[PDB]
Amino acid sequence: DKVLKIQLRSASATVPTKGSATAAGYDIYASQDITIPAMGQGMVSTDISFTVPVGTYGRIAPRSGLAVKNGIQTGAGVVDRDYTGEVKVVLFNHSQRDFAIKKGDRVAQLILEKIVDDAQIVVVDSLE
Amino acid sequence: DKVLKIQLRSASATVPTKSATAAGYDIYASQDITIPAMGQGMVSTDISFTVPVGTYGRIAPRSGLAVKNGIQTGAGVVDRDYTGEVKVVLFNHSQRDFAIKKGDRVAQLILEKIVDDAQIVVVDSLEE
Amino acid sequence: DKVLKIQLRSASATVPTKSATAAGYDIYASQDITIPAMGQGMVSTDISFTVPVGTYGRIAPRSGLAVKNGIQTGAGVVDRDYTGEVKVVLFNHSQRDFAIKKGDRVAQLILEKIVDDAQIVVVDSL
Ligand SMILES: [Cl-]
Ligand SMILES: [Cl-]
Ligand code: NA
Ligand code: NA
Numbered sequence: 001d002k003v004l005k006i007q008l009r010s011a012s013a014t015v016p017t018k019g020s021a022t023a024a025g026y027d028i029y030a031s032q033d034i035t036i037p038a039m040g041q042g043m044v045s046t047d048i049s050f051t052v053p054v055g056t057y058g059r060i061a062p063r064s065g066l067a068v069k070n071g072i073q074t075g076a077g078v079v080d081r082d083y084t085g086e087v088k089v090v091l092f093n094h095s096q097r098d099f100a101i102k103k104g105d106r107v108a109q110l111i112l113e114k115i116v117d118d119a120q121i122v123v124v125d126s127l128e
Numbered sequence: 129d130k131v132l133k134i135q136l137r138s139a140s141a142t143v144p145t146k147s148a149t150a151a152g153y154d155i156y157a158s159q160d161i162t163i164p165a166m167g168q169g170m171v172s173t174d175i176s177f178t179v180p181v182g183t184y185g186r187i188a189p190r191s192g193l194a195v196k197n198g199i200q201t202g203a204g205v206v207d208r209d210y211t212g213e214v215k216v217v218l219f220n221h222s223q224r225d226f227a228i229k230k231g232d233r234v235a236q237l238i239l240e241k242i243v244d245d246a247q248i249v250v251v252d253s254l255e256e
Numbered sequence: 257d258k259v260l261k262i263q264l265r266s267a268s269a270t271v272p273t274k275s276a277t278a279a280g281y282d283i284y285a286s287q288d289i290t291i292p293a294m295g296q297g298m299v300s301t302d303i304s305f306t307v308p309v310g311t312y313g314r315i316a317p318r319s320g321l322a323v324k325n326g327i328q329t330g331a332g333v334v335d336r337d338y339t340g341e342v343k344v345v346l347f348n349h350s351q352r353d354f355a356i357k358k359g360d361r362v363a364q365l366i367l368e369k370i371v372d373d374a375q376i377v378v379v380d381s382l
Pocket of ligand 1: 096097
């Protein structure tokens with residue numbers, strides 16, 4: 001009903017952690033150093049895979065401090081429950097300053113967003 | 129009641145499609161458009177829809193376009209009572225204009241579960 | 257009955273507003289601020305809130321501002337346990353500075369349902 005499975009794909013990967021007991025997400029960590037160019041984008045390696053619980057998808061959502069201080073926003077971010085490859089992190093840098101990331105830094109958070117994933121499509125002439 | 133209602137405004141629209149376990153339904157451009165490099169545009173879809181009770185319709189980014197073309201969705205909160213055309217706002221963070229053709233996939237629709245009837249109460253102290 | 261508890265930290269603050277089938281609650285600036293072209297800024301709201309059990313508060317964009325001002329919301333993950341002032345991170349992707357006056361609607365709060373009590377298992381194979 002709600003188990004979060006992690007595959008650690010190299011020794012460089014870190015298991016996602018909660019920052020508080022009641023935090024929405026799990027911190028996601030870089031497994032390789034990378035720079036996110038100013039007004040640019042990059043893709044951060046994590047060397048992890050996961051299966052989110054039934055009735056969810058995994059949202060790769062931004063860390064607030066990196067937003068406020070470094071101009072960091074996450075891109076992409078919809079991890080399907082069926083998805084089984086390495087979860088990498090798209091970052092946009094909306095600042096004037098390159099953003100240096102080291103192996104071991106928290107770069108994003110994972111939120112298990114509850115969804116309706118079994119809707120019946122009904123095509124209709126008009127809406128209410 | 130977990131029915132997604134779809135209204136097609138043109139033979140140029142495509143009914144959204146979903147993998148039974150994917151989080152999202154594909155959203156297709158109904159008309160050509162280029163998103164300028166370091167800029168934005170609004171993609172026509174010629175569809176309207178009503179999401180299931182208990183959700184809203186989140187217009188979320190396609191992962192491929194994020195990585196390949198620096199494309200992020202903007203706006204993207206579709207209320208359950210919205211009956212107009214769902215137009216897709218796209219930011220292009222890359223250095224290349226992103227050319228979109230009719231029938232191209234440009235976003236995905238996630239039926240996000242929400243609390244949409246919380247009572248708003250004003251209190252002295254959250255801490256209490 | 258589920259409850260969103262709001263604290264008005266000053267007389268400049270506005271209780272958020274929500275139609276019954278709308279997804280979000282409007283969030284208002286409590287102070288003037290300009291968001292620079294191709295830049296970002298932090299909007300003061302002078303409110304704090306506690307979202308219902310099973311949710312976090314997502315600070316999400318207004319659609320009309322996205323379209324006409326290039327405004328995207330940044331950060332926006334407000335944990336249920338957060339009791340500080342909720343400031344709104346705005347990215348301006350347009351070539352015009354965006355002017356915000358106290359009392360302007362700048363964002364929306366959605367009470368996103370989530371699994372906040374999942375247990376991590378580690379596997380060789382997904
Ligand atoms: Cl800067
Ligand atoms: Cl580029
Ligand atoms: Na579901
Ligand atoms: Na906004």
